[PDB]
Design a binder for this molecule. Structure first.
Ligand SMILES: Nc1ncnc2c1ncn2[C@@H]1O[C@H](COP(=O)(O)OP(=O)(O)OP(=O)(O)O)[C@@H](O)[C@H]1O
Ligand code: SF4
Ligand code: SF4
Lengths: 136, 55, 608, 386
RNA sequence: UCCGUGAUAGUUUAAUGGUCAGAAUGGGCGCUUGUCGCGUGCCAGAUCGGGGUUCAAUUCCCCGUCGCGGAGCCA
RNA sequence: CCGGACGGUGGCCAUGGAAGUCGGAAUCCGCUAAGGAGUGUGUAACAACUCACCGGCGGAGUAACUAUGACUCUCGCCUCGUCAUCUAAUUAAGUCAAGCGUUCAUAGCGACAUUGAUUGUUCACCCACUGAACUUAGUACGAGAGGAACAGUUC
RNA sequence: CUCAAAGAUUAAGCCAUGUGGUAAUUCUAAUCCAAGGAAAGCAGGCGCGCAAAUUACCCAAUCCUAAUUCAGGGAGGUAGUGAGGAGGGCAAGUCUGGUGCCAGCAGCCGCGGUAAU
């Protein structure tokens, strides 16, 4: 979360600790995203920081265009897999872990998002809304 | 160095062209050529020449 | 290497007096120091001229100018590619033009000074574009070449040959009364002559526009809304292929502007080409198939974008940014208070404000009825409804300007009032007038942001009000009402003559002062968005225009909005991205579902 | 510049015979102001480039021409100084041998080979410009100190050029077996004294601004504190007023290399205090501080600074690289008088490079400006303008 | 840092008994040789800075400055 | 507590401009009750305040370039090395006050003197995160550059 | 003047436009999205490069396609756009002023260091 995130976010189950790799779901040239940090996460001895739906992470691209590899950039988690629970009572989950590469302000690097996108992320990051097909 | 670029052209003094009889064009000019080269001839100092200045 | 850039200088002659400064522009400029050309003096008109070729882009001249007459900007050579026409040296230049298409309606939207008016003339054949050059003696031939690569190229060949003669509904709303009297004699005469179409067309057109009463009146006599509509009538009646409308929503009320939009669209059905320019988004959305956005600084330049979709163009407009152009055309984004956002106070003040009983005002040709309502302190009430309903009459009675036929309202309160139609009738200059009302209001920083800096009143200060302009005068009048202290303030239709940025400056103005000062305000309006921002309660007027009317007590924002919008029968679901009203078509399942819920509009509120 | 010789004949009290090597385009401009028409130079080229005609034919050689000067083609931007002339015709055979007499011949100067100036009009003004430097324009302001653990170079920039003036060097501390065997601290202590003495003498230590102190290791920082220790000992307020001439840098390499490692690498430099933008920036600040609060205590431009000087209100003089090196020679005389003139009424001086944002701001201002000590109203009147 | 060990002409290094300082090279000097150079004749030190003793100190003490080697423990 | 604080004259030289008030000495005269060739605040520069003082109250030489050294001559510690490469990432108290602080000793400082990788690693060095976000508000102040909070909301 | 090649080489690279419901299709009982869903031919543009034209007119001809006509056809046809040399090899003696191994020439050979074939 943080910059450019207009909205607050209700807690959702943390799915992705540091080291996790999600699918890159944009058209940027990136094939996956390797999580090295979660923004706005706190501190407890021994705890991995771990992201969830609509969290902004800091990632590198393990697989993808060489102009994207070997460096750290912001991304946003768009699909989960660890099931979480909404305030309408529902426990839900996607089939994959996936997020999209983005700028500190929260602008997509790419122009499409392939696959669905959870609403809690859509609601959080307007330029993600824009590029989303099926939401939730 | 770039320095010099265009030194000489820019330091040659202008002299404008002169105003001269218009040369005829085409067939007429060939005519002039044929009479100048072949009809009333010109010189033959030793053999022949086609333009020197003082000789 | 580095990207490419340019310099463009535009100077306002109104602002410039070389005597006081001296031709300081030339003396101070560094290029001229060296012996260069950047600023040349024109001995004739006695004006400074700045050549864009030699200028450095230093901006030294701009700072030195005592007034603020010179403006130099640096652009990435965005403007140079597009040049259509320029008025003259160091003046407004137009860039790109809007595409016309047969069988459809193409919209145009922009802030004032963009050249939307100019663009119409060029398409009309009224003015020939110089092409930012000499082109003058009819050189239509060159214009096609300039347009090559654009769809307008075909249109320009058509225009030159004069196969088509476009019909133009004139833009300047203030200018029209002077030009025509009668049309010659009375509106009715105009409609009979112009009617190339069906005899049905005379009757049908009048019925739909609500022109029935107005036929006998003369054009000069007409009120602003009436004046607009007669022009629209003539643009349906005419026989032609191309019908150009330039600002058809001006002066019109909320009910009427929607009506105008439908009728104009009917032209597309006969497969006649239509073009339109609008300041109103509600109206623009309904009319258009395709939309162009015009952007750039006012009076400096204005470029037209490539054609876009109806939905798409509107969405981009509200962002305040355009990607290809990469310009943030508007400094701040428009937002509406949620109503969660507002401050929470227990309101009464002295226990509630004053209250009015039933009132009636009858002219003898129109009758107004008012239901007893209450007003409270520190609140704001919107007044909505069609003109001729007695929205204006009601405010006057509260002002004490008018005496009620029945009912009475004698309050102790001090009232400040702003009239609806503003025509100058005060001798004096602008600064003198505003200073008499209150100085010190002029000192405040709020007033610098909203009035003084945007327009540049400093230059206006010497100018006469008779000599003045429409929109500029409007912002000044609204501010003046706020100039003096009063328990209650009354404003009538602040949106007139104003573009997008201008109205929204006003919206912030009324809400902020009222909240702060803890005073009350009544505002009359046609603009949906303006009412939403300012108000807490609303009064809706109903009845039939030019006949009778009725008023209601104040009711909550949700309650009042449902009633008003129910009269129109257009729902404005919500767009998820823009948070904008999204219009809903008649007979529908989604729209039908809403009718059963009672939701005309949506905001960041709970609701299905 | 490197001056190989310079002697004063016995038969000529006046003139001189100077053998010299110009090293950069600043040193070309130096040559210019020394060399007169009718002086002689003997240089080399590469003539023998005959007819044909009898034989092939040429030969080659490396033939040196004693040419008397007649004219010059001088282009500072282009790094081109050329002397036109006639052969002196050394009929004595000692010189000029192998050249064919009666035939003009030119010298395009190079930084490669030295040349001899047989001078007629060797004056005291030229002598200044031959043994102090000759930038009456001033581009630089720097000195450096590289030290590794065992080697040091005191470096230094010029009075004119990015041209070393004095390659100092001490016994540097080398990380010995024991706690760093005390010879370290005494020997380092020496160096400060050695560098302070050299810079005091070489310069007028009011001309340079910069000492960069550069090391691989903590050595630089150790040395800074050591400088200011000894500073307090002597009550050396030439050092103590002035936290802004030393600037503390780290590098990998530290030979003459180290300097260009430090500068050009964005580790320790940028547009912060390197001190050759130092007072250059600080005074150009104060110049706009005054001028934009329309106070009459800053003034600008070649017309306007010369008038702000006539009123004799001016302290810190703002001069440029551009207006000097853009193209023009002569012109920079005028401004040099104008600096002294102004200081003869009040002030220091700052030359800013126009290769930078600040110099560009001042250049849009004709590359010449001022700050005054005092307001002197309407300096733009008497002289006519704004 | 302790204890060892030095330093002599432009440079590297011989040397003494307290009264006396060299070599070699490098250089400056000519002659060779077409001309330079190799060669061949000719040439010229405040014995590191420092104070002291003594008739007399390069030589005998004492210190520093520098360059060297050799140690360096159980944490 | 308050009134008065004055003429020679803006002393003199240094003077860019120094008219008492950065500076070099010199301290007079008339006035009248008392008013310094002038205590501190000084606009550049007078003013305009003020106050004192009357009063009302083994080692070296070598360079048709720096460096190196073909040549002549003599008897893996520092290290976490540097460049790449693999990583998002890689040991894989205080006193005195001379001074600064452009004008001013103490705002802020003060000489002299004195009372997650990598590694066993600690450490160190990077990569990230974050009390924060949201409206309050691009607001108040500011020529701009820029930039608040108290209230309410969610983590 | 008559005859007319023509964006293939570069990138088979990319392309603007020419009784009822429903956002909308010739709806049917990488682009537009009422978020549901629906969609290398002429000219002409971008790009690419050393490199290739017009958004025109027409069925008259030549023929073609549909049934007993004379419909259709950017197949096709008309128009628009769209031609140095004077040292030698080379043939000219090259002559007069400026330049000095600078500027420049010169396919090679070679010119050019005040008297430049
Ligand atoms: N006669 C003229 N001389 C010079 N410039 C002119 C002239 N007429 C119009 N302009 C310029 O063209 C621009 C204006 O007009 P147009 O009439 O094209 O505006 P619009 O785009 O219709 O704007 P608005 O919404 O304000 O009516 C102006 O900003 C102005 O500078
Ligand atoms: S534009 Fe301004 S400065 Fe220039 S003449 Fe006019 S008033 Fe003077
Ligand atoms: S911007 Fe600069 S350069 Fe251009 S006209 Fe003004 S002063 Fe001259």
């Amino acid at each position: 979360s943080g910059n450019g995130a207009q909205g607050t976010k209700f807690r959702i189950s943390l799915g992705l600790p540091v080291g996790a790799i999600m699918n890159c779901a944009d058209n940027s040239g990136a094939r996956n995203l390797y999580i090295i940090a979660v923004k706005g996460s706190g501190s407890r001895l021994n705890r991995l920081p771990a992201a969830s739906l609509g969290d902004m992470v800091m990632a590198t691209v393990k697989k993808g265009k060489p102009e994207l590899r070997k460096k750290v950039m912001p991304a946003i988690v768009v699909r989960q897999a660890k099931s979480w629970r909404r305030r309408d009572g529902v426990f839900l989950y996607f089939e994959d872990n996936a997020g999209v590469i983005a700028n500190p302000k929260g602008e997509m690097k790419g122009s499409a998002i392939t696959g669905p996108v959870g609403k809690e992320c859509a609601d959080l990051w307007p330029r993600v809304a824009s590029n989303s097909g099926v939401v939730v | 160095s770039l320095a010099r670029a265009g030194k000489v052209k820019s330091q040659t003094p202008k002299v404008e062209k002169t105003e001269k009889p218009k040369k005829p064009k085409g067939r007429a000019y060939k005519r002039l050529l044929y009479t100048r080269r072949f009809v009333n001839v010109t010189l033959v100092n030793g053999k022949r020449r086609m333009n020197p200045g003082p000789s | 290497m580095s990207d490419k850039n340019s310099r463009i200088a535009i100077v306002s002659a109104d602002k410039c007096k070389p005597k006081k400064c001296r031709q300081e522009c030339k003396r101070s400029c560094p290029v001229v120091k060296t012996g260069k050309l950047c600023i040349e003096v024109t001995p004739t008109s006695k004006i400074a001229f700045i050549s864009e070729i030699l200028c450095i882009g230093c901006g030294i001249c701009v700072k030195k100018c005592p007034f603020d007459a010179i403006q130099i900007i640096n652009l990435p050579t965005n403007l140079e590619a597009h040049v259509t026409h320029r008025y003259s040296a160091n003046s407004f230049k137009l860039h790109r033009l809007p595409t016309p298409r047969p069988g459809q309606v193409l919209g145009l939207v922009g802030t004032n000074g963009i050249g939307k008016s100019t663009a119409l003339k060029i398409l009309a054949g009224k003015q020939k574009p110089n092409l930012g050059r000499f082109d003058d003696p009819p050189e239509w031939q060159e214009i096609i070449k300039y347009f090559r690569g654009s769809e307008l190229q075909n249109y320009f060949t058509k225009m030159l040959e004069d196969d088509i003669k476009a019909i133009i509904k004139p833009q300047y709303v203030d200018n029209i009364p002077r030009a025509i009297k009668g049309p010659v004699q009375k509106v009715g005469e105009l409609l009979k002559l112009r009617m190339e179409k069906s005899p049905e067309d005379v009757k049908r057109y009048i019925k739909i526009l609500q022109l029935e009463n107005v036929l006998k009146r003369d054009i000069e006599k007409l009120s602003g809304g009436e004046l607009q509509r007669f022009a629209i009538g003539m643009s349906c009646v005419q026989e032609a292929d191309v019908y150009m409308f330039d600002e058809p929503s001006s002066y019109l009320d909320v009910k009427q502007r929607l009506n105008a939009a439908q009728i104009i669209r009917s032209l597309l059905a006969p497969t006649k080409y239509v073009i339109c320019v609008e300041h109103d988004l509600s109206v623009l959305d309904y009319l258009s198939d395709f939309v162009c956005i015009i952007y750039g600084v006012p009076s400096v330049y204005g470029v037209v974008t490539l054609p876009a979709s109806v939905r798409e163009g509107i969405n981009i407009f509200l962002d305040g940014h355009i990607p290809a152009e990469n310009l943030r055309f508007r400094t701040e984004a428009l937002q509406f208070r949620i109503a969660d956002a507002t401050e929470d106070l227990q309101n009464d003040s002295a226990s509630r404000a004053f209250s009015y009983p039933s009132l009636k005002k009858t002219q003898g040709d129109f009758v107004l009825n008012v239901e007893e309502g209450e007003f409270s302190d520190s609140e704001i009430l919107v007044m909505m409804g069609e003109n001729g309903t007695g929205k204006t009459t009601l405010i006057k009675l509260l002002a004490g300007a008018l005496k009620p036929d029945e009912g009475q309202d004698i309050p102790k309160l001090n009232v400040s009032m702003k009239p609806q139609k503003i025509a100058p009738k005060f001798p004096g200059t602008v600064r003198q007038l505003f200073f008499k009302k209150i100085r010190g209001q002029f000192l405040n920083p709020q007033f610098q942001t909203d009035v003084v800096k945007p327009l540049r009143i400093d230059d206006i200060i010497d100018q006469e009000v008779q000599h003045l302009s429409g929109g500029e005068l409007q912002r000044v009048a609204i501010v003046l009402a706020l100039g003096i202290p009063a328990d209650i303030y009354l404003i009538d239709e602040p949106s007139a003559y104003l573009d997008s940025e201008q109205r929204i400056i006003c919206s912030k103005v009324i809400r902020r002062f009222i909240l702060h000062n803890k005073k009350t305000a009544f505002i009359v309006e046609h603009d949906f968005i303006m009412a939403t921002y300012l108000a807490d309660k609303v009064i809706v007027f109903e009845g039939i225009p030019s006949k009778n009317a009725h008023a209601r007590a104040p009711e909550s924002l949700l309650t009042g909005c449902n009633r008003f919008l129910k009269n129109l029968n257009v729902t404005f679901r919500r767009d998820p991205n823009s948070f904008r009203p999204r219009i809903n078509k008649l007979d529908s399942q989604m729209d039908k579902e809403q009718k059963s819920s009672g939701n005309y509009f949506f905001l960041d509120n709970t609701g299905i | 510049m490197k001056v190989i010789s310079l002697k004063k004949d016995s038969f000529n009290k006046g003139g001189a015979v100077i053998t010299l090597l110009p090293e950069d385009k600043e040193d070309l401009f130096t040559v210019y102001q020394i060399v007169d028409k009718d002086d002689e130079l003997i240089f080399k080229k590469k003539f023998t480039s005959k007819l044909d005609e009898a034989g092939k034919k040429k030969s080659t050689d490396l033939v040196k021409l004693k040419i008397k000067v007649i004219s010059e083609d001088f282009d500072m931007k282009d790094e081109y100084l050329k002397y036109k002339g006639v052969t002196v015709t050394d009929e004595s055979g000692a010189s000029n041998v192998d050249i064919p007499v009666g035939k003009y011949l030119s010298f395009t100067l190079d930084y490669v080979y030295p040349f001899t100036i047989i001078k007629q009009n060797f004056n005291k003004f030229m002598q200044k410009l031959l043994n102090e430097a000759c930038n009456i324009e001033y581009k630089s302001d720097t000195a450096a100190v590289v030290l590794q653990e065992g080697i040091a170079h005191v470096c230094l920039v010029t009075s004119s050029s990015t041209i070393l003036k004095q390659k100092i060097e001490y016994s540097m501390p080398k990380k010995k077996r024991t706690t760093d065997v005390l010879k370290f601290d005494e020997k380092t202590e020496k160096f400060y004294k050695a560098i302070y003495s050299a810079m005091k003498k070489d310069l007028n230590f009011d001309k340079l601004k910069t000492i960069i102190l550069c090391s691989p290791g903590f050595y630089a920082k150790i040395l800074m504190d050591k400088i200011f220790q000894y500073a307090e000992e002597e009550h050396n307020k030439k050092i103590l007023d002035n936290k802004g001439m030393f600037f503390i840098a780290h590098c990998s390499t530290g030979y003459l290399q180290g300097i260009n490692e430090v500068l050009k690498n964005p580790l320790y430099a940028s547009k912060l205090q390197d001190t050759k933008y130092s007072k250059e920036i600080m005074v150009m600040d104060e110049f706009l501080l005054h001028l934009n609060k329309d106070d009459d205590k800053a003034w600008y431009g070649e017309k306007e600074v010369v008038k702000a000087a006539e009123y004799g209100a001016i302290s810190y003089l703002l001069l440029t690289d551009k207006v000097l090196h853009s193209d023009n020679i002569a012109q920079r005389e005028e401004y040099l008088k104008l600096m002294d003139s102004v200081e003869s009424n009040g002030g220091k001086a700052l030359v800013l490079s126009t290769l930078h944002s600040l110099g560009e701001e001042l250049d849009q201002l004709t590359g010449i400006a001022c700050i005054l000590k005092y307001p002197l109203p309407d300096l733009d009147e008497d002289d006519g303008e704004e």
